[PDB]
Design a protein around this ligand. Structure first.
Ligand SMILES: [Ca+2]
Ligand SMILES: [Ca+2]
Ligand SMILES: [Ca+2]
Ligand SMILES: [Ca+2]
Ligand SMILES: [Ca+2]
Ligand SMILES: [Ca+2]
Lengths: 157, 156
């Protein structure tokens, strides 16, 4: 037995400034593990991470990604899968993200999508302080995570 | 309203030899429409065609794609979603195909996946005769298509 329960999929590109939030989280976890999470350093596209996640047979999947939500830099929100669909959130390959989330939810049964608001996103940009702070905030909630980890739902109307 | 019922997604790359089966079907349809199908010339990856298919609000989606099924060149089969999953069929972006099909099934209802067996797949290869023939065969069934268009299920 693997004894796997929780899986954390970190999405992003460290070569794209604040889009590096996900890879940064993966780096922190590698250096100092928190909780029971198996952490996937997913990079730019979640599509090619799906097969591994399903094979891990998790009970709970957390996805962390820098995502423009129209908020102040570094704000953290959980995005409801219905709002993922309504917002037309896309992967880098222009796949609608709700397709992946909704299907994962059928196989896993708790799937949480967590967005962190970037400020600057561009090739070889540095990460800004509010995003570094947000990544620390999420990291510190990984141990003993329950529900939505105490984070607010994104308000989309 | 658009009055749309049937959508045909053609998958493939004309610059990859027998992988051009899908694009060829799109070309035939554009030149001489068959049935009520709205035909999407989907190219290499179906991922970026999903939003348009969903917006079209079809009741039935037929997907046509050159796919290695371990059969003789030009053989045509319908691949059941269970088998798509078990085979670990992948898109060009390594997205499992079964996730895409299963979610389309929720949004559309009836989703049919038709595979055509290629022989040769390579950059700037020609298409081989059995695959040309297979594309013609599928084309001729589009008008008045019912069920799985008379094609056999892939045995795997
Ligand atoms: Ca990936
Ligand atoms: Ca991102
Ligand atoms: Ca499913
Ligand atoms: Ca501790
Ligand atoms: Ca496409
Ligand atoms: Ca061959």
């Amino acid at each position: 037995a693997s004894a796997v329960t929780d899986v954390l999929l970190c999405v992003g590109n460290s070569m794209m400034g604040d889009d590096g939030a996900g890879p940064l989280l993966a780096e922190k976890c590698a250096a100092a593990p928190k909780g029971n999470w198996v952490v996937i350093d997913g990079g730019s596209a979640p599509e090619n991470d799906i097969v591994a996640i399903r094979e891990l047979r998790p009970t709970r999947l957390l996805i962390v990604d820098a995502t423009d939500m129209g908020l102040n830099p570094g704000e953290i929100r959980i995005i409801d899968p219905d709002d993922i669909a309504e917002m037309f959130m896309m992967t880098t390959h222009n796949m609608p993200l709700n397709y992946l989330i909704d299907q994962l939810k059928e196989d896993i049964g708790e799937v949480i999508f967590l967005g962190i608001q970037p400020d600057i996103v561009g090739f070889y940009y540095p990460m800004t302080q509010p995003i570094k702070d947000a990544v620390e905030t999420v990291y510190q909630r990984l141990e003993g995570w329950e529900g939505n980890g105490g984070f607010a739902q994104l308000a989309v109307e």
